[PDB]
Amino acid sequence: VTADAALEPDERAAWLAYNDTAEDFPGPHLLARLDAVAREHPDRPAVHAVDGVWTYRELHRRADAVAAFLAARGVRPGSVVAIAATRALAPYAALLGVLKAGCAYVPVNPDDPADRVAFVLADAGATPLLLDTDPASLPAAPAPDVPHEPDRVCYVIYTSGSTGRPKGVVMAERAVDNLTHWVVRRHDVRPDDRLGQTAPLTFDPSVQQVFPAWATGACLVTVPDDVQRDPAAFLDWLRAERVTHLDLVTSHWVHLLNAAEARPAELPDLRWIIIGGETYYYHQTHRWHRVVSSPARLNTIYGPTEAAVNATEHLTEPDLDHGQVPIGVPLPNYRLYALDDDGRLCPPGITGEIHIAGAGLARGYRSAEATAKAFHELEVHSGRTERLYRTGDLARLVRHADRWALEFQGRVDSQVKISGYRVELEEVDAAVKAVPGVRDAAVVVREQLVCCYVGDVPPDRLRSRLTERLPAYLVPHLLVPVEA
C-alpha cells in the first residue's frame, strides 16, 4: 500500500529522521520584507551592475515606475512579463517592478535565438513590453495599488534536458520566500554583505543571490561577463569587489580551482560559496583549500529548478581528501525520498530515484502534459500523502558523520550539463545538421564542448549560423571539419 510498506523499523526510522525538516520562519512575506528594507535602509547600495550602483531608494523607485507602466498597459496582477536578462541595472528594476505589479517575471536572454525567445513568450503567456523599451527609463510614478494575494507566481524559468521541449517552471511565492529565509539564515547574510550573482537571470541560482540580498539590505553584485570566462580575472574580481557570498556551478568552480593552483588566492571577505550541479570529490575540495586563503566555506547543494533552486545541502569539510562529497540533508521544509521503479521507498544504502516534496515545489510547468508527467501524489508513510516532483536523479541514503545524507548517483536519461545547464546532446547535433552544407556531425564533451562535422562550411561561417540558431552556451567551443 504505502511506499514504505516493506521496510523494517530501523530502515523506516532512517527516512523519518532524514526528512524531519520543518521550520517556521517569521513573517512578513517576501515582498513585504523587501519593502521594509527599502524603508529602513534607503541609502544602502542594493544592486551593483555593469553601468552603476543603485541605492535601495533608487531601485525601488525604478521598480515602481515599471509597475505603473505595466498597469497602464493593461497588465493586471497574475500576468507573466518578460524581462531582458543582461548584466546592467535595468533588469533589476524590471524584475522587481514586475513583482510589485503582482506579476511574475520570465527572464529572457536578448541574445538567444529569436525562435527560442518566441517559444518562451508563447509558452509563458508573457508580454514583451519590457523587452521593447528600456525599463530603467520609464516615467517616474508611485507604485500601483496591488493587494497582496498569497502564493502569487513569482517567476517562470525555462529548463531543458529535452530538445524541442523547453519547459517553463512556474514558481510561486511561498517557495521563493522559504528559499530566501534559508539563504539568509544558513549563510548569515547581513546588511554589509556583497552577494555575487554569477548565474545570469535566466538561471535560477540568481534567485538565490538576489532576494537574500534585497531582503537584508546587502548589495547584489552582478558578476560581469568579461570576468567569468576568465578564471584568473574572476578570482581577482572577487577580491577587488569584497564579495561575501557567491553562487557557482561545479564546472565553473573547477576552473577557479585550476586558476587558483596557477596563482594561489587570498579572499578574506568571502564567507560562502553555494556550489553544485555535478558530482565532485574531496580530493578536489582539499586542493581548493590548499591554494585559497579564505574563511569561505563550500556549501554543496543539489536540486532541480522545479523545487526552488536547491533541495539539499552539505557543508563541505576541508579536512577530507578522498571520496565523493554527498549532497546532504534537505533544506528547511523540504522532504526527499529515493524510490524504486515500483515507487517503493528504498532502504538506506540502496539507489533509487529522488522524488521531492515540500515548500520548495513549483506550481508545475506552464505545460499540462509536462506537469502530469512529473508531479504526482503518493502515500510514502502511513498517514503521509505527499505531492511529489519526480526528478530523474538517482541517489542513496548513506551515513556521513552521525547523520543520514543523500549521495547522488547519476541520471535516468542521457541528459548532461553544459556550464550548469540541462541539455540533450542530440539538440546540438540536430542544429549543426540543419546548417546548409553540413551533412553529418558528432558533438562531444572533452569543461569543453567539441564538434566534428562533414561538409564545406568553414568553421567561422558555421559558428555564425549556429549563434543565430543556438544559445551561446550550446555553440561548440571549437568546430573541426572532418572528411568522414
Residue 243 in grid coordinates: 564579495
Query: Which of 198, 201, 219, 215 minimizes the C-alpha distance to 277?
Result: 198
Structural determination approach: X-ray
Strands 352-358 and 334-339: antiparallel
Distances in Å between the Cα of 32 and the Cα atoms of 41, 309, 399 are 14, 22, 40
Q: Rounded to an integer, what is the distance from CA 215 to the centroid of its chain?
A: 18
Specified resolution (Å): 1.6
Strands 292-293 and 334-339: unpaired
3-state helix, strand, coil in the chain (%, to 5): 35, 30, 40
Burial 8-29 (b: 16+ CB within 10 A, else e): eeebbebbeebbebeeeeeeee
Q: At a CB cut-off of 8 Å and minimum separation 6, what does 138 contact?
A: 62, 65, 66, 68, 69
Is 433 marked as binding a ligand? Answer: no
Residues 449, 461: Cα–Cα separation, whole Å = 18
Contact 194, 242 (CB under 8 A): yes
Residue 77 in grid coordinates: 496582477
Residues 262, 265: Cα–Cα separation, whole Å = 9
Residues 320, 131: Cα–Cα separation, whole Å = 48
CB atoms within 10 A of CB 262: 12
Report phi then psi at 174, rounded to 5: -60, -35
Contact 429, 444 (CB under 8 A): no
Hey, what's the torsion of the CAs at 185, 52, 135, 366, to 10 degrees?
A: -40
Residues 318, 300: Cα–Cα separation, whole Å = 12
> Left (φ > 0), alpha (ψ -120 to 50) or beta: where does 49 sit?
beta
Is 217 marked as binding a ligand? Answer: no
- In DSSP terms, 330 is beta-bridged to 312
Q: At a CB cut-off of 8 Å and minimum separation 6, what does 1 contact?
A: 379
Residues 325, 311: Cα–Cα separation, whole Å = 16
Polymer length in residues for the chain: 484
Hey, what's the torsion of the CAs at 143, 102, 135, 141, to 10 degrees?
A: -10
Contact 80, 126 (CB under 8 A): yes
Strands 272-276 and 297-302: parallel
Residues 394, 338: Cα–Cα separation, whole Å = 8
Residue 416 in grid coordinates: 548532461
Strands 416-418 and 45-49: unpaired
Residues 241, 236: Cα–Cα separation, whole Å = 9
- Dihedral sign, Cα of residue 461, residue 464, residue 470, residue 476: positive
Q: After which residues is the chain broken (C to N over 2.5 A)?
A: 446
Burial of 263 (0-12, 13-18, 19+ CB in 10 A): exposed
Contact 133, 83 (CB under 8 A): no
Burial of 439 (0-12, 13-18, 19+ CB in 10 A): exposed
Query: Which of 191, 185, 250, 245 minimizes the C-alpha distance to 221?
Result: 245
Report phi then psi at 410, rounded to 5: 115, -170
- In DSSP terms, 403 is beta-bridged to 400
Is 325 marked as binding a ligand? Answer: no
Is 319 marked as binding a ligand? Answer: no
- In DSSP terms, 335 is beta-bridged to 357
Is 352 marked as binding a ligand? Answer: no
Residue 433 in grid coordinates: 545538421
Report phi then psi at 436, rounded to 5: -75, 130
Is 66 marked as binding a ligand? Answer: no
Contact 24, 32 (CB under 8 A): no
Contact 343, 3 (CB under 8 A): yes
Is 177 marked as binding a ligand? Answer: no
Hey, what's the torsion of the CAs at 307, 308, 309, 313, to 10 degrees?
A: -70
Query: Which of 118, 225, 205 minimizes the C-alpha distance to 472?
Result: 225
Contact 371, 174 (CB under 8 A): no
Burial of 41 (0-12, 13-18, 19+ CB in 10 A): middle
- Amino acid present at 465: R
CATH 3.30.559.10 fits 415-481, yes or no: no
- Amino acid present at 280: Y
Residue 233 in grid coordinates: 580575472
R_g (Cα) of the chain, nearest Å:
23
Burial 46-63 (b: 16+ CB within 10 A, else e): bbbbeeeebbbebbbbbb
Residues 143, 424: Cα–Cα separation, whole Å = 43
Q: At a CB cut-off of 8 Å and minimum separation 6, what does 81 contact?
A: 70, 75, 94, 98, 101, 103, 104, 105, 106, 126, 127, 129, 130
